[PDB]
Amino acid sequence: QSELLCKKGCGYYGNPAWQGFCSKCWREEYHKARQKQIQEDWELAERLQREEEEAFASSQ
C-alpha cells in the first residue's frame, strides 16, 4: 500500500520503466498503442497509394 500501485488499479505494482503500469496492464496498453499505429499507417499507405495512382495517370 503505497504510491507505487499500478495505474489501472488492478492490485499489482507498477514499474517506473512502464510508466506506472504492471507487466500485464503494460502489455494491454502496448497492444492498444500498436493497434493505433497500424491503423494510422494503413491510412498513410492509402494516401501514398492514391498519390502514386494519380501521379501515374498524370503521365499518359
Binding site: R34, D41, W42, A45, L48, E52, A55
Partner: protein, 73 residues
C-alpha cells in the same frame, strides 16, 4: 526476430529480420518472397516512410512490429 509487412491488397508478408538489417536489405527480403523490386517499394512505419540506408533499430521496429507496403509507379 519477426516483423510483418501488410499490403493494401490483402497480403501480409512475414519477414525474418534482425534489428541491424538495413531498410534496403528488408526490401531485398520482400523481393525474395514477392518478386517486387526494392526500388518499387515504399515501406511505412509509425507515420514515416522508411529510409533505405537506415536500419530497423533506427525506427524502433521490434518483435511483432507491423509495417505497410506501397508500390511505386
Amino acid at each position: 526476430m519477426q516483423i510483418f509487412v501488410k499490403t493494401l491488397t490483402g497480403k501480409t508478408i512475414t519477414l525474418e529480420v534482425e534489428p541491424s538489417d538495413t531498410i534496403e536489405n528488408v526490401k531485398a527480403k520482400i523481393q525474395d518472397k514477392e518478386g517486387i523490386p526494392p526500388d518499387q517499394q515504399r515501406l511505412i512505419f509509425a507515420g514515416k516512410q522508411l529510409e533505405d540506408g537506415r536500419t530497423l533499430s533506427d525506427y524502433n521496429i521490434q518483435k511483432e512490429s507491423t509495417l505497410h507496403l506501397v508500390l511505386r509507379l
